[PDB]
Ligand binder design. Structure first.
Ligand SMILES: *[C@@H]1O[C@H](CO)[C@@H](O)[C@H](O)[C@H]1NC(C)=O
Ligand SMILES: *[C@@H]1O[C@H](CO)[C@@H](O)[C@H](O)[C@H]1NC(C)=O
Ligand SMILES: *[C@@H]1O[C@H](CO)[C@@H](O)[C@H](O)[C@H]1NC(C)=O
Ligand SMILES: *[C@@H]1O[C@H](CO)[C@@H](O)[C@H](O)[C@H]1NC(C)=O
Ligand SMILES: *[C@@H]1O[C@H](CO)[C@@H](O)[C@H](O)[C@H]1NC(C)=O
Lengths: 345, 337, 341, 340, 349
């Protein structure tokens, strides 16, 4: 009758309930249906190959030892401090770098016990999960990160995890990422890791992320385009100004080398060539070819002899051949990475 | 017999078991078998001379005080709740070559405690240790780092505790990719060091030595190419007509300033060491080539104050600079292949 | 005759029989908790990681009939903060938080007060790095409204209800100031009442209207960019015959501001849209690029007659047009982003 | 037996209750506290805070800790036994974060005198916060604040105050890497007020004065030398147009870069600081030198009697500019000597 | 008899031993002998003025309450779990900023009890000790960072610290440093700090650290050395080529300002001047004077048979400068590198 005596008779010292033994010992494995509710998503840094989530992890498992009939109500809420006196399913995230609980004025845990013995356990965590990156096309990539749930204390012979059939993964309304667009289709598969000591259960949820051009198209690509146009504008200067025209070719390579150094500064060290890397390296050839054309023109003019006619001819030939070359090559580079040879799932 | 009663009679304050006393007290040392399961690898920061791993350290030993009675025969093994890892004896263990290490605790402790029939006990923990390995930077582009991980014992000497590696396949790892290095699974050579501390006694230490071979792809695509372009620009400065006398200084001076900026940036990016590096050799060679271009231009300008001599100097220098640079580059690559 | 220790054991102690594991009014009406905060420190707003830190003296009040005493004549009785662990507390957690911790220096920074009718005051010192999204459409003169949310976690809305205090719920410490912003005196108070699969949870929300002063930015990159563009105009009065002077002027004025834009963007997070400072710097870059381009056209005209007169004409046109264009652009840009949008 | 003495004094057999302050429902207990600064430094303006390392000590009297078994009056007890006696609440109000020091044991001291007085000293490490005014950046005087304050008990039950003599000690040889710590330290009552009640609070002020050495070497001197370099154009022959425009250009560029680098190390503040005026005015001088060159070039291109006017303007400026720079520099130091 | 009963009778609950009372209570102070074993070193950050160690701190003392006779064995090792249940001497590092234990698979502690009653206690630690440094001659400086052991609870009237007679500080073989080299000599002193509460025992050990110029030379001096070579190679350029000479001066001065900024970026700001600032400032003044000498020559060639013939005088000025500036720089190099290495500085050794 008394609620404190009821709790003591249910799971207290007088109860005789044991938290050291899993339910249904030496019998069928205990099925644990879990689902997560993402609260905060972000800090997806490519340098450290990691990202941070903030999930309301929940679990639902059945035990017969927690059956009660004194209270007519079926669903009952308990103090979160009762959780140490009941059996819990071991559950650790395999692909993580650092995680912690959250306590403010109390632990952020919810415990609910149903009449038939079903238990709803939910705890608030914060995970710095690790997911591999692919930077073949760095500004136009579709990077998918993973969150693995796997048991550690018991093999699959005793503990089995599986997602909830309806609404397995939720996202808070108004969720957004600073640079990415989280998809709405989230895949659910089975990892089921198999170590030499035993075969352990493992549940995996996939996350799909797509990067936008918004920051890069306006910070990275456009300045290089205007630099190449600056090196371009040399052809229209008079050829007698030997130190004047060459100055543009001198400065463009320096500034674009500095821009290239800054471009890969905030990116992880990778062997393969990145899309921004190839774009800017190939743009380097154009600004260097401007200086090469000037050197050829000056050498021709510096050995009447109709050489000035040939110098103007090569000047206009360059000023008419660079447009087609850039306008065709850059659009080809765009289309191949967009659809033709990359991206497109 | 209830499982509660079996647990109580096996290891509890209600049974004659003392966790503070090692098995076979004042007798044969307790042989301990250890095997590691790498899970996550990387973040090898050369600046701090350390790297971070994430392992599943598993240790199994013998303990006659933990014998499963023949009353019930359910299985050879018997899983126990991880919270009783603190109720039975454990072997003292730590990593000598470790900087900052910690356990993991998410929704439960990450510990597994098997108990066998004959008394053998298997124990595994999930650890995230930050080991430090002394990197050698003599040949930066084609280096081969040798980072190791040595276990040890602290409380007990070799007369009580002794570590032995697994008989077969002691170190495992599944499809771990690295951003900068290429760990070789076959080259997992490992011995043991049996560290001897003066004033206390012997202490067993079994070590694993990882062999890492850095790929030079990123550096080749990022650092060496701009230097090559600067060298080609210095060469192209030669063909400029010397009559201007002011359209040839800027190319060379700005090239040497760019090289100065590059070497400063690379020094800032790299840890501070006293010895020379191959990358430093490349940078100083490029800067010396720029200085040579500057002094050659100065010589030509002096000789201009004669035009035949200036033209001969220009032709000879333009003939010797690129072939000499190519020979130097080829021999440099051959030395540091 | 009644020793205080015996009284404490009689009211909340082991002899009392009070159970801290059961909420007040069990199987009854939901327990209401009127909570109010007291900000002590504010600031450290960093846009790169999109969060801010507060140092609040969180307080809570609720009624619990099991803590009613009539032995002591005094009504407001204070207790040792260590007594908290022996009495019930209301669950609470800050929904939009990234890292939280108490403050333990020579003791726990907690305060317990118990009234005669059972009303309990419990104030605990916290420190929260709450997360608040920002709209950076007009970055130099933005208006951010960061949010602090208080919410129950364990008990549902059917058992625990959070309500702001009637008057003066959120205060500010005297002399509180920020290095970059202005904290408005008004602070909106609204409910949110979030719900999930488990059920409906009570919620509490407070809005801190924040505004930015352009004092630092106007002197850090607005004035320098204007001075650089003013430098770029001095090429007009240089004789068209002399090439290298005008070439160097144009080149350096173009080059020196790309690094300015990179440095300005370095301290800001990556964003898809375009910020006002970005628009200003891009327009200045276009202006200086056109300044170099017009000189290129002049040099083309001079080098092919009396075309030198036409070169002087176009130079004068540029000299009389560029200041006008920059003035009209500045008066256009400093009006819409400042007042209209 | 010492164990029996400890048990009878304040142990399990004693019946002492650690949850009740001395003189319960009576006069407030007066607590005298004096601190000992051990290491002072790590003063960073980027986060607007500084780190101390204090040997905080407290003294209070309680009648329940009086003994007569031991003739000795000053008794030292194990620090691990501190959990069984009443300890006054004490938190540092202007603290951004603090932590104890546990190395091989708890760093605590307990001392019980015969009359009942108790000495309690605990080592700490406080990252306090102190707002700074940057009106005169290289020659400012900041007063960073340490505030002791009670939290659990109101003024009606706990009163703090400094010792009569030697309240704050600084370890011999202590010095600041950045500032010059004064010997004078103000000790004022703080006495904060809240809506819960009246809480006692104790304030001690540290007078911090900045040393101009590093700034003078690294930031003023290069600016002065660079603006001196900007003057080298006025002696060059006017024929070399690119030579003069070049030095003007690179001087302007390098001074802008120096401004960015100098302000990269300070917190963002709405108001202008002292250093920015000097550097901005020197940059304006370089800009005006370039502009005067441009004007003289215009004059040269309109023996036209213009060579005389161009040379007159150049020579007049070559002497007016040093006078203007000297008078501004003297005025800029004089105004800051007026402020301080 | 039984080992569990032996442990209970020696110092367990049945024993009656009290861990809250120091040995030899109301008697002579319990002397404690400590000796450390360094396992790693380095991370000496000049900016924050601290260094990190990894020591196997050890202690020895006596107490008659732990004397045993049942077991003939003398050196008896005990579980570190038991270690918290015996009296231990208070100890802390005064000049520390942050320290912690190491808990990996167990607590890294050791407990040993000898027959005569002596106790051994070795605990792993990790100290971010603080050591102020003097940077009067930074690139070629010598530093003496300290590790100051001290008691906190008991006064010198109840606890006395002292080093071991033989090999007090041991260093694990093969240890090296990233930026310095550790001298084999380690001075030991007595610090015996005095407070307003009493006389406290204190023990200080000196570490001598010397900085090698391997990195700093090739990163600062040699590039700054070649910049001034670039600066004087203009003197062979004819005055006629005015833009070449002036550009050769200004780029050289600008790069040296940038290099000075980059050099000072790695040190805490100090009111006093350092060696690297002297070198950088003088060598930069040299290129500034080279540009100014250009300005003077150009003015001379610009009107200072009635011929001006100022070309010959300008050529003489250039010839004198080309023979004076490299020579003056060479004598400055020798004088500075000897004066900051032999006679009045670098005598701290
Ligand atoms: C757990 O589910 C498995 C199938 O996945 C089933 O065989 C077993 O009986 C279940 N155990 C229960 C419901 O206790
Ligand atoms: C450890 O090294 C010692 C060296 O004496 C050797 O006797 C022993 O067999 C080694 N043990 C292992 C497991 O390698
Ligand atoms: C508590 O307040 C709520 C609304 O906040 C109200 O419905 C309820 O009646 C109040 N009192 C009790 C005893 O539940
Ligand atoms: C504390 O000091 C106050 C000062 O007014 C005094 O009234 C009170 O009696 C003192 N209490 C003591 C000494 O216990
Ligand atoms: C411990 O050493 C001190 C200092 O030398 C000495 O006075 C004392 O007698 C020694 N022994 C004991 C048992 O205190």
């Amino acid at each position: 009758m008394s609620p404190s005596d009821f709790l003591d008779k249910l799971m207290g010292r007088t109860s005789g309930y044991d938290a050291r033994i899993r339910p249904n010992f030496k019998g069928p494995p205990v099925n644990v249906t879990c689902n997560i509710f993402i609260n905060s998503f972000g800090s997806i840094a490519e340098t450290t190959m990691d990202y941070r989530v903030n999930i309301f992890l929940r679990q639902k498992w059945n035990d017969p030892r927690l059956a009660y009939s004194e209270y007519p109500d079926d669903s009952l809420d308990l103090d979160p401090s009762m959780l140490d006196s009941i059996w819990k399913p071991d559950l650790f995230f395999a692909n993580e770098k650092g995680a912690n609980f959250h306590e403010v004025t109390t632990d952020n845990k919810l415990l609910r016990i149903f009449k038939n013995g079903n238990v709803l356990y939910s705890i608030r965590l914060t995970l710095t999960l690790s997911c591999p990156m692919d930077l073949k096309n760095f500004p136009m990539d579709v990077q998918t990160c993973i969150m693995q749930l796997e048991s550690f204390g018991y093999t699959m012979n005793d503990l089995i995890f599986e997602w909830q059939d309806e609404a397995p993964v939720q996202v808070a309304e108004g969720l957004t990422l600073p640079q990415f667009l989280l998809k709405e289709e989230k895949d659910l598969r089975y990892c089921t890791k198999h170590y030499n000591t035993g075969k352990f259960t493992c549940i995996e949820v996939r996350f799909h992320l797509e990067r936008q051009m918004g920051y890069y198209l306006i910070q990275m690509y456009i300045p290089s385009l205007l630099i190449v146009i600056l090196s371009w504008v040399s052809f229209w200067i008079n050829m007698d100004a030997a130190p004047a025209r060459v100055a543009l070719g001198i400065t463009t390579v320096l500034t674009m080398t500095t821009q290239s150094s800054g471009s890969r500064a905030s990116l992880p060290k990778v062997s393969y060539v990145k899309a921004i890397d190839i774009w800017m390296a190939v743009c380097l050839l154009f600004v260097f070819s401007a200086l090469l054309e000037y050197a050829a023109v000056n050498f021709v003019s510096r050995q009447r002899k109709v050489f000035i006619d040939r110098a103007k001819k090569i000047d206009t030939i360059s000023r008419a051949c660079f447009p087609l070359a850039f306008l065709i090559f850059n659009i080809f580079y765009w289309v191949i990475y967009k659809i033709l040879r990359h991206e497109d799932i | 017999v209830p499982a509660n009663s079996t647990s109580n009679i096996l290891n509890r304050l209600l049974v004659s078991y003392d966790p503070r006393i090692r098995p076979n007290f004042k007798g044969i040392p307790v042989d301990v078998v250890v095997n590691i399961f790498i899970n996550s690898f990387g973040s090898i920061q050369e600046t701090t001379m350390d790297y971070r791993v994430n392992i599943f350290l598993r240790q199994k030993w013998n303990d006659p005080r933990l014998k499963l009675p023949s009353d019930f025969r359910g299985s050879d093994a018997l899983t126990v709740d991880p919270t009783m890892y603190k109720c039975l004896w454990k072997p003292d263990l730590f990593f000598a070559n470790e900087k900052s290490a910690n356990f993991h605790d998410v929704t439960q402790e990450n510990i597994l405690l098997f108990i066998f029939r004959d008394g053998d006990v298997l124990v595994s923990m999930r650890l995230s240790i930050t080991l430090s390995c002394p990197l050698d930077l003599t040949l930066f582009p084609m280096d081969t780092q040798r980072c190791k991980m040595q276990l040890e014992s602290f409380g007990y000497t070799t007369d009580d505790l002794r570590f032995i590696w697994q008989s077969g396949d002691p170190v495992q790892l599944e499809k771990i990719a690295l951003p900068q290095f290429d760990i070789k699974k076959e080259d997992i050579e490992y011995g043991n060091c049996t560290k001897y501390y003066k004033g206390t006694g012997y202490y067993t230490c079994v070590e694993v030595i990882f062999t890492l071979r850095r790929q030079v792809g990123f550096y080749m695509m990022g650092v060496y190419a701009p230097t090559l372009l600067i060298v080609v620009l210095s060469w192209l400065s030669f063909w400029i007509n010397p009559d201007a006398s002011a359209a040839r200084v800027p190319l060379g001076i700005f090239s040497v300033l760019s090289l100065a900026s590059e070497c400063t940036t690379l020094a800032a990016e790299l840890p501070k060491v006293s010895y020379v590096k191959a990358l430093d050799v490349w940078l100083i060679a490029c800067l010396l080539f720029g200085f040579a271009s500057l002094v050659e231009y100065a010589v030509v300008q002096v000789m201009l104050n004669i035009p035949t001599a200036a033209k001969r100097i220009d032709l000879y220098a333009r003939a010797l600079f690129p072939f000499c640079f190519l020979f130097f580059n080829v021999i440099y690559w051959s030395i540091y292949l």
